[PDB]
Design a protein around this ligand. Structure first.
Ligand SMILES: NC(=O)c1ccc[n+]([C@@H]2O[C@H](COP(=O)([O-])OP(=O)(O)OC[C@H]3O[C@@H](n4cnc5c(N)ncnc54)[C@H](O)[C@@H]3O)[C@@H](O)[C@H]2O)c1
Ligand SMILES: NC(=O)c1ccc[n+]([C@@H]2O[C@H](COP(=O)([O-])OP(=O)(O)OC[C@H]3O[C@@H](n4cnc5c(N)ncnc54)[C@H](O)[C@@H]3O)[C@@H](O)[C@H]2O)c1
Ligand SMILES: CC(=O)N[C@H]1[C@@H](OP(=O)(O)OP(=O)(O)OC[C@H]2O[C@@H](n3ccc(=O)[nH]c3=O)[C@H](O)[C@@H]2O)O[C@H](CO)[C@H](O)[C@@H]1O
Ligand SMILES: CC(=O)N[C@H]1[C@@H](OP(=O)(O)OP(=O)(O)OC[C@H]2O[C@@H](n3ccc(=O)[nH]c3=O)[C@H](O)[C@@H]2O)O[C@H](CO)[C@H](O)[C@@H]1O
Lengths: 311, 311
């Protein structure tokens, strides 16, 4: 197939590009390097099955781009990713995550694209649901602008599906970690911890450290994207996680172990916009896509620390 | 109270301004005249309790405006209102209806505003719903970009409510009609019919004329805004309608009978994005707010025709 990946210079995006190429697809990457990194794609310089387009999804002529490249599937991973940043500038977050998605859908519906695979946020969209692990049937209740824009994006794509029959599915990951996650990013606790502990710099947890997340390895997430790209799960969201909770404090201990040395984080005040608890029910992805996560946290953390050592 | 009404130069907006003035409130009207008309407010030239601000919610410094006027309640009626226009340019519709709402909320949460009363769209947000009349508990399923943006607007305001305790309620009217509705657009069937039939100009219905809507009179809708402005229904949507379905053809007959001319509309192709049926369950507004619609269609049509006769 011809595939186009927005956010392709990023952590999950670049990993997805690699998988698609390995599966024998031709892949257009698109990114504006807001948070992405050239080194994430540098290995592809001589691969003729890959073409990279620098473009801002907010302002670029996406119609022209899609008309030129004719992707069958668009994997949409370009986004403002930081919850705290979304609180500080909700307009900017909404422009990238909502307007950007709308512009892409409008371009795609006119250029013969079969399907857009959206990236939602399984971690943030549910808020404080009565059910953990949380199924997709649980009402959304975003408590950050980031979460709100992600929901908004799903809704718009569902709208384009009704209007034009432009197919869509929403990949809703939990907390994704692994090789290529930015060590110096504002988000990405595993990368942050690995970076800090390997350089013997201070680390911190927020609140009393009891916040929980559902940590899912990047390769597992990438596999879900691939599975959902087919003519399946139309207009549906799929939670992509492990369905297991790890506290901030427990994760610190797990990274500290893999790195070796001290397990002694500082305790800082809670961050406005951050949920206290997150855990995804992944039953639908299994029943519908045949998808199951392969990597357990211990194994994944090893692989991640391994990566950060080599760099 | 100190009120601010966005979309104040518009149909519902100007009518709401009048009501708030009549109730003894001070009112700041805000509009950019995208679809609003100065003539809707000209009667206030020498009214001592209204001040007008010409501003675009997408780009103006709303922070400074709200800082100056310190409104307790913002009635948010500024929007791109045409479903077909939203299909033709979903980006523009999203910019006004989503980005504008976000900018407003972000300004409001910083300027001590107590509550934003949002205008959703009870007619469009449910798409094709499971049942008619449709209650607020029915899932949203927008099938036009306009509908999608209204849903997104609700969600963002709920988010700001979580973040900052900036209160919000969502007025979700059906199909509003009455004096001051612009007769020169493609939206606002009652006004379009009334002016055309009065002038002996051609009229049209779309498809086979069987589309139904729930026609609710502007004065009733305005009363709902007033009631919900108090500390009641935080984070909730209220359907505002009559719970009665009238077909396009039936509506044309009603307007023609009031005008007194022929009842012979042209039939034009169906409009992409337009739902076939709309009917709202108004039980929640009745219980919580004590709101009930007073004006039946026949009465409302008469009042509307008479406004256009003398204008
Ligand atoms: N990492 C997680 O835990 C996680 C889980 C759920 C959702 N997500 C979603 O996954 C996607 C990828 O995130 P990531 O973890 O790889 O982070 P990332 O920052 O590495 O990737 C995001 C990419 O989008 C690009 N981008 C941002 N704004 C853009 C714009 N206006 N135009 C073009 N490109 C733009 C960035 O430059 C970057 O390369 C995002 O949609 C994110 O919201 C991430
Ligand atoms: N008429 C209906 O049947 C109905 C029912 C449900 C929802 N609504 C909502 O009610 C509200 C009022 O609509 P209406 O029927 O009075 O239509 P209208 O066009 O008369 O009023 C909308 C007003 O918003 C203003 N506006 C638009 N974009 C703006 C911007 N960027 N900055 C500032 N002002 C801007 C317009 O100039 C206009 O005065 C809208 O939010 C509409 O979506 C209407
Ligand atoms: C629950 C939730 O909304 N999850 C989403 C959110 O992740 P988060 O915003 O939760 O990601 P993050 O890596 O910033 O935080 C994860 C966890 O680690 C903790 N922490 C973080 C940094 C640090 O130095 N120390 C520390 O303890 C933090 O308190 C939290 O409980 O955004 C991601 C994109 O960026 C994804 O969309 C996730 O699905
Ligand atoms: C069901 C629905 O989504 N309703 C919403 C939508 O109204 P609509 O988009 O339904 O409003 P409209 O006045 O454009 O059309 C109402 C009805 O009148 C018919 N018609 C219209 C014009 C004409 O010349 N002849 C004719 O027959 C049309 O086929 C439709 O069935 O948008 C409004 C804002 O603008 C509100 O948000 C409404 O809640």
């Amino acid at each position: 197939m011809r595939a186009l990946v927005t956010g392709a210079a990023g952590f999950i995006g670049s990993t997805l590009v690699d998988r698609l190429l390995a599966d024998g697809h031709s892949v257009v990457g698109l990114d504006n390097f807001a948070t992405g990194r050239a080194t994430n794609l540098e290995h592809l310089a001589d691969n003729s099955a890959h073409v990279f387009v620098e473009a801002d999804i907010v302002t670029a002529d996406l119609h022209a781009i899609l008309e030129q490249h004719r992707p069958e599937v668009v994997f949409h991973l370009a986004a403002q990713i930081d919850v705290r940043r979304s609180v500080a500038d909700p307009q900017f977050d909404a422009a990238v995550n909502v307007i950007g998605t709308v512009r892409l859908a409008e371009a795609a519906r006119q250029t013969g694209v079969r399907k857009i695979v959206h990236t939602s946020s399984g971690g943030s969209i549910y808020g404080t649901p009565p059910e953990y692990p949380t199924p997709e049937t649980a009402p959304t209740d975003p408590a950050s602008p980031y979460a709100a824009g992600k929901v908004a994006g799903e809704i718009y794509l569902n709208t384009f599906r009704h209007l034009y029959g432009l197919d869509c599915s929403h990949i809703a990951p939990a907390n994704v970690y692994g090789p290529r996650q930015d060590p110096h990013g504002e988000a990405g606790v595993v990368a942050i911890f690995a970076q800090a502990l390997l350089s013997g710099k201070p680390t911190r947890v927020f609140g009393d450290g009891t916040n929980t997340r559902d940590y899912v390895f990047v390769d597992d997430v990438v596999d879900a994207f691939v599975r959902v790209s087919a003519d399946v799960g139309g207009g549906l969201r799929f939670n992509i996680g492990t369905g297991k909770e790890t506290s901030d404090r427990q994760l610190h201990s797990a990274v500290a172990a893999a790195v070796g040395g001290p397990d002694d984080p500082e305790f800082h005040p809670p961050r406005l916009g951050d949920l206290k608890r997150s855990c995804l029910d992944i039953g639908l992805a299994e029943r519908v896509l045949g998808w199951r996560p392969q990597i357990e946290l211990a194994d994944g953390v090893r692989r991640t620390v391994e990566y950060f050592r080599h760099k």
